[PDB]
Design a protein around this ligand. Structure first.
Ligand SMILES: Oc1ccccc1S
Ligand SMILES: [Zn+2]
Length: 258
């Protein structure tokens, strides 16, 4: 059966195998900009990616992941709402079949064409597997993509997608610099939440950047030619791999800017 994003195994079904789906701190959420609270106690983010070592890009059947060496403090995130050092391990995207949908978080109900998740784990826990069992285990930088002008720093990724078209294909992907994917400002919203895919673990401190990056229609078109299926299986295009917004419940969205 295996979870996915179709009519018979999509988000509305996940709770049957993953009861945390109906949890207290699920993601994504809509960010109501008038109800978010400015917090002057919040620090600026510290992104230190100059020593990043990318290894591989992989189609895992529900997105593509770019993987990094996380055996040392090469690429890390500090500051913001975080205590401690968080190591970059991978990034992926979620995107839509149309330009008007694709992001997971929304801002005053507005949807963007895609959302970038840069995933980091708290080095006090020793490895990624242990971190995801902890309420402060991961920090995920969420960046919105809107369609407009091309993003130079995304094109090396776009170029290699045809070689990982189906589930289980991987390719070498060294010397990729993720700084090419950041917006110019690092102002953010932050709230405690979860993975937006199974197993939906409630271990994430979300950090959602205010400023979107722009990408060209031609760049996102190439995302939409990937396949959910494996080679030799009937073709299903990899589109709309996003989960709808979940109820905020007892949580406060905090803003770093006023
Ligand atoms: O947010 C971390 C790891 C894997 C997937 C998502 C986050 S969707
Ligand atoms: Zn994600």
């Amino acid at each position: 059966h295996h979870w996915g994003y179709g009519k018979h195994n999509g988000p509305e079904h996940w709770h049957k195998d993953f009861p945390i789906a109906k949890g207290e701190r699920q993601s994504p959420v809509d960010i109501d900009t008038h109800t978010a609270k400015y917090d002057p106690s919040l620090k600026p983010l510290s992104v230190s990616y100059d020593q990043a070592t990318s290894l591989r890009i992989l189609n895992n059947g529900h997105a593509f992941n770019v993987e990094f060496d996380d055996s040392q403090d090469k690429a890390v995130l500090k500051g913001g709402p975080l205590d401690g050092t968080y190591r970059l391990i991978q990034f992926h995207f979620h995107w839509g079949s149309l330009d008007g949908q694709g992001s997971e978080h929304t801002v005053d109900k507005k949807k963007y064409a895609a959302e970038l998740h840069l995933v980091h784990w708290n080095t006090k826990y020793g490895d990624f597997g242990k971190a995801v069992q902890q309420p402060d285990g991961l920090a995920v930088l969420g960046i919105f993509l809107k369609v407009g002008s091309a993003k130079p720093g995304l094109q090396k990724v776009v170029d290699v997608l045809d070689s990982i078209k189906t589930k289980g294909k991987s390719a070498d992907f060294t010397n990729f610099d993720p700084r090419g994917l950041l917006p110019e400002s690092l102002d953010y919203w932050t709230y405690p939440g979860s993975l937006t895919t199974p197993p939906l673990l409630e271990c994430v401190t979300w950090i959602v950047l205010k400023e979107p990056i722009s990408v060209s229609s031609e760049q996102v078109l190439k995302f939409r030619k990937l396949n959910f299926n494996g080679e030799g299986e009937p073709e299903e295009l990899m589109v709309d791999n996003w989960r709808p917004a979940q109820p905020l419940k007892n949580r406060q969205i905090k803003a770093s800017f006023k």
